[PDB]
Design a protein around this motif. Sequence first.
Motif, PDB file in Angstrom:
ATOM      1  N   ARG A 147      30.585  17.479  -9.014  1.00  0.00           N
ATOM      2  CA  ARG A 147      31.653  18.479  -8.954  1.00  0.00           C
ATOM      3  C   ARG A 147      33.028  17.768  -8.897  1.00  0.00           C
ATOM      4  O   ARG A 147      33.104  16.569  -8.616  1.00  0.00           O
ATOM      5  N   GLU A 148      34.101  18.500  -9.166  1.00  0.00           N
ATOM      6  CA  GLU A 148      35.461  17.971  -9.147  1.00  0.00           C
ATOM      7  C   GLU A 148      35.845  17.423  -7.769  1.00  0.00           C
ATOM      8  O   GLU A 148      36.572  16.436  -7.662  1.00  0.00           O
ATOM      9  N   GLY A 149      35.362  18.076  -6.717  1.00  0.00           N
ATOM     10  CA  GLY A 149      35.657  17.670  -5.352  1.00  0.00           C
ATOM     11  C   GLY A 149      34.851  16.487  -4.854  1.00  0.00           C
ATOM     12  O   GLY A 149      35.196  15.915  -3.823  1.00  0.00           O
ATOM     13  N   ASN A 150      33.788  16.085  -5.575  1.00  0.00           N
ATOM     14  CA  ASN A 150      32.956  14.959  -5.132  1.00  0.00           C
ATOM     15  C   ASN A 150      32.836  13.798  -6.143  1.00  0.00           C
ATOM     16  O   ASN A 150      32.255  12.777  -5.787  1.00  0.00           O
ATOM     17  N   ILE A 151      33.342  13.958  -7.381  1.00  0.00           N
ATOM     18  CA  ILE A 151      33.138  12.990  -8.464  1.00  0.00           C
ATOM     19  C   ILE A 151      33.631  11.580  -8.136  1.00  0.00           C
ATOM     20  O   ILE A 151      32.917  10.623  -8.435  1.00  0.00           O
ATOM     21  N   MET A 152      34.794  11.431  -7.492  1.00  0.00           N
ATOM     22  CA  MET A 152      35.284  10.086  -7.150  1.00  0.00           C
ATOM     23  C   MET A 152      34.374   9.375  -6.145  1.00  0.00           C
ATOM     24  O   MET A 152      34.045   8.196  -6.342  1.00  0.00           O
ATOM     25  N   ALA A 153      33.916  10.099  -5.105  1.00  0.00           N
ATOM     26  CA  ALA A 153      33.005   9.530  -4.104  1.00  0.00           C
ATOM     27  C   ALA A 153      31.645   9.238  -4.700  1.00  0.00           C
ATOM     28  O   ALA A 153      31.003   8.269  -4.296  1.00  0.00           O
ATOM     29  N   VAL A 154      31.173  10.100  -5.630  1.00  0.00           N
ATOM     30  CA  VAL A 154      29.896   9.900  -6.289  1.00  0.00           C
ATOM     31  C   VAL A 154      29.976   8.643  -7.143  1.00  0.00           C
ATOM     32  O   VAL A 154      29.102   7.789  -7.047  1.00  0.00           O
TER      33      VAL A 154
END
Lengths: 5, 5, 123, 123
Positions: free
Chosen positions: C92-99
């Motif tokens: 998701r947009e809210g988790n993509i960087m951490a993923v």
Amino acid sequence: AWVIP
Amino acid sequence: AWVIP
Amino acid sequence: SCIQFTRHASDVLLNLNRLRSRDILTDVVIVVSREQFRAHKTVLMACSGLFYSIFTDQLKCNLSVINLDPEINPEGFCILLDFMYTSRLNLREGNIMAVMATAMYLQMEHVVDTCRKFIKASE
Amino acid sequence: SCIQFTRHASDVLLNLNRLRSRDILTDVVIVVSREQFRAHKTVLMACSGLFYSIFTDQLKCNLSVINLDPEINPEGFCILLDFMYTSRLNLREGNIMAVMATAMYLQMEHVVDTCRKFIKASE
Ligand SMILES: [Cl-]
Ligand SMILES: [Cl-]
């Protein structure tokens, strides 16, 4: 690969 | 399911 | 001369995930800051270059607890752990960087590639 | 909202099989008469109703050696163990009866079904 399951 | 791979 | 059962691999993974949910034969706890995740060492190694290196190390192979770098986000780890056992990535947009940062650390090239493509398309 | 990596399950199984060949993190020996087979308990359980019952038993779960019934053919077991880790069943006219009897004992319904169909067609 990637698909919409 | 069964296929010939 | 072999015959192949097409759904076998997905069925096996389905059962390994059911074992994980019921906490059956889980042999390692992955600590990601305040959070703990129970898993099977073989599934982690089969999915991650980092866990493959850890669990083939003659000393680390015997550890029941592995602490990840404090920079690792527990939700990002959680999503990648669900991906390992299910083939489905909750991106998701809210988790993509951490993923993406977590997949790079865990060495999961396919996840890194898909994350890069979803980032480039947005932007 | 998940995305899915189609080859993930087969890749995982491919790696679990590479672990088996290299004898990495194998935690059980299956004794079939004179023969020994090293395997991962979780893969056996994920593929077989018999191993699922054995390794969820509070006492048997802790055993490092499981002896099968002396009526079990080691080649038949070997072929089913390769099937578990690869999705490919080496079914031949000279081994089909032993493969089928072994799949019934191990509780592997899909293998039993394909064996029954290859028998009926001949017949
Ligand atoms: Cl990956
Ligand atoms: Cl089966």
